[PDB]
Design a protein around this ligand. Structure first.
Ligand SMILES: [Mn+2]
Ligand SMILES: [Mn+2]
Lengths: 205, 205
């Protein structure tokens, strides 16, 4: 069974960018629900229940028809939020190989940011914006609801290894930013954990 | 060009069921944006910019490929919310032909409510839950994002004439109910305008 991971920081560790109230509800209520639903759906599937969540979502097409959607949504929700919590932290600085790779594939850090912000703002409805590694090149993509690039293009309409991502579901920014998603996206740059991003870039797996 | 319709009541007229703050933001910010974006896209389509919004969304396939999506989302958003505001009011009572039709197609008012709540709660991500009239029969369906049954099955995955609907985007209930969509759905029964629903049922068009 999957366990709801604890946050690696206080619920107000991201202030004044991301509000403490949202962090708490988002983690203990929203993420918790995805974990519960995912575990309930895996109760009778011992074969898949043992796999890590990141791997399970790469094998959705191998699940019984009546289990595919529930797990896509909830196991997806669990995987995405787990990555999200670890991808946040104040005080980091983009540098090293990751920075070089970004300037290489986007021309500059500013171009990249503009491209990322555009993808995040243009995702209509619920979804996520991602910086993925497709082989040797970095790219910005977005997915709907709780889909992940790890699920493959046939399912999510996107592919690649997630380096970092931004949750654009309204529950992630409505309490503080209301309808102003652009303001939320701007604040994100202040809390994106570049150290974690660099680590994932180095691992590539 | 479309214009934000004025609400048929004060922003606090639905208290203590739907909060005043959300009503105000939902109307003056969210709905306003759909209206603004739909007008921006229609500036270049004189032959469509004159059609009533409910009619425009039935002709999405006749639009230029690069306009279909933007109008589907924004004209859809405008049509759905316009219907939503008129479908809310305290103090009404389900009765007459509509009530008979519901008991006829659902067995009872309670079965109908249970079915509606299930559709509204099971819509993953952003969307709407609807009570539609199709083939002389009433049915409960749901759509994603700002899609409407009026758009047709090929586009929205649903069809029929909307009698009443419930907005299940998180911006419609997060401030007061947070993650508890079920509680929000329950409060809805206290503010659904049965008079308007009956009127639409009688019109059938
Ligand atoms: Mn989330
Ligand atoms: Mn809405």
């Amino acid at each position: 069974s999957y366990t709801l991971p604890s946050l690696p920081y206080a619920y107000d560790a991201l202030e004044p960018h991301f509000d403490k109230q949202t962090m708490e509800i988002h983690h203990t209520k929203a993420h918790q629900t995805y974990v519960n639903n995912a575990n309930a759906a895996l109760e009778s599937l011992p074969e898949f229940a043992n796999l890590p969540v990141e791997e399970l979502i790469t094998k959705l097409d191998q699940l019984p028809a009546d289990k595919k959607t529930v797990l896509r949504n909830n196991a997806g929700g669990h995987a995405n939020h787990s990555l999200f919590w670890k991808g946040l932290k104040k005080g980091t600085t983009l540098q090293g190989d990751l920075k070089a790779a970004i300037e290489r594939d986007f021309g500059s850090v500013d171009n990249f940011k503009a491209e990322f912000e555009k993808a995040a703002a243009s995702r209509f409805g619920s979804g996520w914006a991602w910086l993925v590694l497709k082989g040797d090149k970095l790219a910005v993509v977005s997915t709907a609801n709780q889909d992940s690039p790890l699920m493959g293009e046939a399912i999510s309409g996107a592919s690649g290894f997630p380096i970092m991502g931004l949750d654009v579901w309204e529950h992630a920014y409505y309490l503080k930013f209301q309808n102003r998603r652009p303001d939320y996206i701007k604040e994100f740059w202040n809390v994106v954990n570049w150290d974690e991003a660099a680590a994932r870039f180095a691992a590539k797996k």
